[PDB]
């Protein structure tokens, strides 16, 4: 009865490397720059993934741009939490196979408290024992979690497509669960986990803006496409021009 599970398994992007030189001594600038680079190349793959998500390419192109601009941070934080879970049991932040943050790096990064919050989020994957299929469904849903306060070009269609992917998450749970009561509870837990991303991503957007503004004094380069996305929509997010779409 789940109709998207194998599609989502086949369009899932491969793992991206940072290219960080893990022999240099860590600095704030080296760590945040490396993260920006990794972010750029992950964003390229997130765009190819979003384009392959059934129904997405049927939204107006301006809505596709809006959705990616708004949700890239949430999608990438969620994917990174999943990687941390599957590879180091959420003990360290697994940005890339060649950029793992231990405690020390979290301190040098200058964004320690945000790193701790993101590691707590990965621990939620550990406690819930999130399966790969649930992960893929929820990550697809994260592309439908934020919209402009005035809405999209075709709101009606976005609403129906979002409802369709919510239903798919439920179908995956009931395909895997035991009882109707247990699967209802599981849906509740996993939509709460999705909802809990929003305050984290808000804080991360604030930090991102702070860094973007200070990029010259801090020697933190932002690559081209990240710069254009950030300066395009992060001020609007911080100004309250967007509205989270809650799942629970």
């Amino acid at each position: 009865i789940p109709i998207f599970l194998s599609v989502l398994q086949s369009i899932e992007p491969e793992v991206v490397y940072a290219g960080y030189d893990n022999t240099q001594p860590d600095t704030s600038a080296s760590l945040l720059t490396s993260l920006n680079e990794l972010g750029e190349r992950q964003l390229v793959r997130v765009v190819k993934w979003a384009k392959a998500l059934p129904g997405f390419r049927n939204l107006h192109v301006d809505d596709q741009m809006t959705l990616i601009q708004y949700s890239w941070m949430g999608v990438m934080v969620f994917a990174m939490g999943w990687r941390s879970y599957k590879n180091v049991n959420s003990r360290m932040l697994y940005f890339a196979p060649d950029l793992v943050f231990n405690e020390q790096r979290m301190q040098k990064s200058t964004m320690y408290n945000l790193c701790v919050r993101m590691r707590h989020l990965s621990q939620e994957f550990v406690w819930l024992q999130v399966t790969q299929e649930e992960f893929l469904c929820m990550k697809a849903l994260l592309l439908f979690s934020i919209i402009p306060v005035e809405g999209l070009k075709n709101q009606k269609y976005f609403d129906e497509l979002r409802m369709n992917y919510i239903k798919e998450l439920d179908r995956v749970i009931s395909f895997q669960g035991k009882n109707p009561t247990s699967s209802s509870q599981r849906f509740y837990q996993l939509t709460k986990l999705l909802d809990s991303l929003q305050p984290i991503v808000r804080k991360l957007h604030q930090f991102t803006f702070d860094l973007f503004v200070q990029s010259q004094s801090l020697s933190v380069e932002f690559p081209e496409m990240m710069s254009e996305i950030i300066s395009a929509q992060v001020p609007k997010i911080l100004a309250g021009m967007v509205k989270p779409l809650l799942f629970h």
């Binding site: 390229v44 192109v61 601009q69």
Partner: peptide, 9 residues
């Protein structure tokens, strides 16, 4: 324009 370029591919 870069995001729009990736979308139009």
């Amino acid at each position: 324009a870069l995001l729009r370029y990736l979308l139009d591919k």
